[PDB]
Design a protein around this ligand. Structure first.
Ligand SMILES: [K+]
Ligand SMILES: [K+]
Ligand SMILES: [K+]
Ligand SMILES: [K+]
Ligand SMILES: [K+]
Lengths: 95, 95, 95, 95
């Protein structure tokens, strides 16, 4: 399960890296703004302070959402079930 | 399962086509902006750079969300489980 | 199952009615804008063209989201599984 | 189950408290605006009336979303299944 977590951890990192590079280059965002935008899109929060302005950006964002949501929320679920939950359970007991 | 994927693939395309046509016509968006808006609504990202301005648009959007979310996220789940996952698993092995 | 659908249908209507009344009165929106805002909040699309400006509105919105999301998305799931799916299946066969 | 609900209730409160403090201090929001922003981020509504302006805020928000979504939506699910549902069922019967 640490190796199920590890795979989706890595995939998530690669996915956010892809969006950092694309949105920094094509749409002109700072590396940090691209990452932050990528995270806020794939988690569907979607604040809208940085939306894409070019048609290639609009198109890319359509695909990135469809390819990216399933992966991101799979990581979030494994994180919550396999990491967050046990550590909570462990706090409820003194060793 | 390729035929389960195919059905929801097609339905999704038809759903986004319906929103492209409606938002291009009634709300006056470019074909590409309508599609992009339709995708960002049904995935619930909801950036808010293009929201509907007319009452018919507001009303249509209420129904489109309720009818459209269940379908879109069904496609996303089948895509992630039946397409993305196996291809990941296959990369972990050299043929 | 028509009676499982009916219950969550009604509850959803009452939930959106509650937000229509509150956001029309306290925040000053048109009936139609309040409803549209209520739908876009509880489905988490959250465009942000109409956000609440008063502290009572901010507070109310915190509770409305927590009480309202679980219900809305339960309706959406039952709608997609018990209504949308069978009607799709039925189209694939000529009577 | 009241004690499953209680744990996730408390955790949720602590999670929103953490975001209230951070966004009030670092980003300069009013206590009430920080809380409201924290709720609208972790439920992914993401209106975007208050987004973070500093790089430390941007970074913090990336982690807060990943750590916070799994917990918030776990509370929402338990609330809807273990509290909201039974009380609805009970209304359908006169004692
Ligand atoms: K969302
Ligand atoms: K959203
Ligand atoms: K927004
Ligand atoms: K906005
Ligand atoms: K949003």
């Amino acid at each position: 399960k640490d190796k199920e977590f590890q795979v989706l951890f890595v995939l998530t990192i690669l996915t956010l890296i892809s969006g950092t590079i694309f949105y920094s280059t094509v749409e002109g965002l700072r590396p940090i703004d691209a990452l932050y935008f990528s995270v806020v899109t794939l988690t569907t929060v979607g604040y809208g302070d940085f939306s894409p302005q070019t048609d290639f950006g609009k198109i890319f964002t359509i695909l990135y959402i469809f390819i990216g949501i399933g992966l991101v929320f799979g990581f979030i679920h494994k994180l919550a079930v396999n990491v967050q939950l046990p550590s909570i359970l462990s706090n409820l007991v003194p060793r």
